[PDB]
Amino acid sequence: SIRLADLAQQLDAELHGDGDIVITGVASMQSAQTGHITFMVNPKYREHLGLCQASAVVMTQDDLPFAKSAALVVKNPYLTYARMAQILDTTPQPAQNIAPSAVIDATAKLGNNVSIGANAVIESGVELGDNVIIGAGCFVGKNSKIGAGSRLWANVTIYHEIQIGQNCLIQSGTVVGADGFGYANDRGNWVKIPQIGRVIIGDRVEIGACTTIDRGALDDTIIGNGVIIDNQCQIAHNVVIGDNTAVAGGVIMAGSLKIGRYCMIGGASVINGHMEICDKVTVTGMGMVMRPITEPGVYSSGIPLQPNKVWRKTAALVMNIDDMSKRLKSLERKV
Amino acid sequence: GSIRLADLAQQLDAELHGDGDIVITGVASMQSAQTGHITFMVNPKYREHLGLCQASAVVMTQDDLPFAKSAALVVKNPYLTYARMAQILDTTPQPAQNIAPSAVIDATAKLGNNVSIGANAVIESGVELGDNVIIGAGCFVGKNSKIGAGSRLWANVTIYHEIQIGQNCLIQSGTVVGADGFGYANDRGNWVKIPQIGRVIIGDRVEIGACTTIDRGALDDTIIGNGVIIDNQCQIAHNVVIGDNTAVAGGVIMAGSLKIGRYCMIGGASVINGHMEICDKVTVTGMGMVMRPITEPGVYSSGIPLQPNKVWRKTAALVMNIDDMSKRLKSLERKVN
Amino acid sequence: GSIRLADLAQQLDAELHGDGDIVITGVASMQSAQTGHITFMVNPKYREHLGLCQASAVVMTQDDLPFAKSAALVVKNPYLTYARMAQILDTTPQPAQNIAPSAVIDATAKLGNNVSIGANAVIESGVELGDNVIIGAGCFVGKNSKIGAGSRLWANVTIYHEIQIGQNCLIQSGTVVGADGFGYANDRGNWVKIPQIGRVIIGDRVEIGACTTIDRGALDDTIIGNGVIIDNQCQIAHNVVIGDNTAVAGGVIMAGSLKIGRYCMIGGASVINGHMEICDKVTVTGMGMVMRPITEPGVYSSGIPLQPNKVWRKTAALVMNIDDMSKRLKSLERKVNQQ
């Protein structure tokens, strides 16, 4: 719980109303009750603000005349919402102290205030920085290093020789450092190429659940600082992702792709490897990326949904588009 | 467990034709069935083949009966009867039995009657497990989550905090329920985390396949209706709502704040945009690219399917240059007119 | 781990040019290699660059040898020799060693010789682990499953009940073998679960990537042939059959009752529908949408690639309206045919 005046100071917002109001939590506009702070970004909600029962609403200056409660005025209500949600966060920690059921190699190096959940398994040579939290059931493999403040939720798998920076967060079910998909061929028989590169994850990286980031073949798979990666993503061996890039859910990246900084990869895209994407590229959902991208901007692919009856005809005609092209050329030749 | 054919027929509401004292030990396919097995026929093309089936009994329709070469259970719907007799004769083990000494259970967790928790599972403070709940080995159930009576988690399932799961659900291994939604604000190119303090509410009789992820909501909740079935490796983003009885096939990716109605069927590997709605009674065929809201019931499809590579190269290049093709068509129309 | 260059050369059947007493400690890329490392060259464009490489030895071909600025191992196939030498010098640790005290092992489980079981792994009743099997930390192996000699599971792999895994397999973390297939009947609008009492049978020398799911069959079995390699995040549905030596790249989804032949190559993120067959020696390129059986060997492809968004908007609009284009073309043809 926090006083509205104090909250507004920490958010650098201008208070309009009783600064003695006690705020206990954040809520959506429709769910907010007495004691909740909420926010609005879309002007369509201005008109029924009198129906919102929050104790305070974060809004812009042009929103103030419509306010029907205490208001915090800011330039960017969505960013201010992020900040106040952090102040008022109710999310528990993955673990507290070291659990008696955790299995920790005696050669592990642990910083101060490290927490390790029940039945986690820490291999030899592992280094956990100050304030690192390892959730229940995790595995951290030989000689891996996790920087100060980083946290793994329950049932995360980190392989050997992995480096993770400071203040990272990895959601459950994710696997960092599995073998890349590397094989030679000896007369139709696959020959395993041991994958002895690593994964290097920078600072302030957030990785979702059931995502996989393979280790490099010789040199490393690299995730830059400030990168966010959603659930169900595959990052193949020797991918390099530049700082602050965002990868939405279900994206598949093939080996040796290089993505620049400040990119935004839409959900379920497929990005082929051994190529580069420059800084500040957006690929919309399900994008089929077959070629290098050398200019910033938004790129898209795919023929979207139609009623099945229409789709049958669309797909049949497209599959015969070479015959359509030949017919058009013949008609030109004749005319 | 073995059962007399007469008793099985009564529990299945089937008409017995043959020896009621035959002992049935299990269910098998028609081609694999051996003595002691019961099987079923749905395709009358196999009538002439029944003499090759070594099952002790065969489920079939009244129209099939004259072709039987075994004891027969006559029913209106052999497939549904098959589902029912396979449940009666199910050989699937339970994920756990009793409470394992290696399980780690907070003293404040509330266990109902006949709860089983497998080896090395971890149950946080405040968790409530209803009567007959089974938690498989190596699971994690986070603080204050609640799992309704008769629900079962296979091994290595992760439930975060404040999750609500209904009665008689079944969740396969590797599934993660309640991870943070993908919520971030952008500050001059840097991502600022938005804590995800909503929940997941899963209804009654929900089945979730392996390595599916259902994220918790940002403020309000991600909601899965009753009777929903979800296959493997689906992503259900924060604040998605899925209506009762909807089926989601394998590998479907949903963006945040999608609402799917009741009675929908979403084909495998489909991709669905967020912040929009799909109405009731919609079927999306496999690999559907769902970019826009769906406002009328019915069947919807997308995608240009496989061709020989040499052919595909021309299809792809021509489609990519279809604007030029369109302009050439228009120009030729003007010249001819 | 370390080995004299002469001994390494013999084991690789390579011709040594240089000092056989050099001690090799590991493999590295050309750019990262330092004293003690062996590396390899496959691209002759780097001949002029070998003077910048600080490896103790470089694997190359006879045609490369005049360009060497180091001890050289001459072979016919530097890439294959690289794979073999990386195995000889492999630094990958084992998933476990010995039987961990925190593992929970049913009294009826049967273990071969030199089995290792990692911390907090859980082994159900009736399980049989062959000689030299390694089960990683936190794994689950369900009732009556059998894992053949030499096979290894990394940490946090889930094997359900009645699963059979052959010899010398390797399964990466987060993978789930034997979950229920997606089987349900319909009772007046209510889903009715169909128990999935088939199994999964995995052959010898199968490698399966991370967070891959392979479901058990409904009555008969899901089958993975020998020598199959499967990447991360793949989904193999109930009753799929995959033939020997087929490769499946990452994020591939296969629907129920698909049969894939031998020596196939399925590109990443492909979607393969079920109740159909793909013959031997078929390559499906990445993101392929497979809706129909494939009866002839060769290379097959689908998908319309990326364009700038403003261009894609016009492409998509025109394609979605292609029936009108087809009608206009037919009408124009009739006019030109004087009809």
Ligand SMILES: Cc1cc(C)c2c(-n3cccc3)nn(CC(=O)NCCCN3CCOCC3)c2n1
């Ligand atoms: C699942 C999904 C599915 C479809 C079909 C589409 C879509 N679409 C519109 C036309 C063609 C595709 N657009 N989008 C949204 C989208 O891709 N935005 C750009 C990337 C967002 N960044 C922000 C931070 O995280 C990383 C990702 C989608 N999403």
Ligand SMILES: CC1(C)CC(=O)c2c(nc3nn(-c4ccccc4)c(O)c3c2-c2cccs2)C1
């Ligand atoms: C739930 C049910 C008993 C019936 C059903 O509707 C269904 C089932 N299994 C499926 N597998 N795949 C699939 C999986 C992977 C790749 C490609 C396709 C579908 O698309 C499936 C569908 C659907 C078809 C159209 C919409 S949902 C079993």
Ligand SMILES: CC1(C)CC(=O)c2c(nc3nn(-c4ccccc4)c(O)c3c2-c2cccs2)C1
């Ligand atoms: C098994 C092997 C040694 C050789 C191989 O054939 C192969 C390999 N790695 C791949 N990654 N991706 C991929 C991954 C993610 C997104 C997009 C593409 C492919 O499609 C891959 C393929 C194939 C190409 C065509 C058919 S299979 C390594």
Ligand SMILES: [Mg+2]
């Ligand atoms: Mg333990």
Ligand SMILES: [Mg+2]
């Ligand atoms: Mg996918």
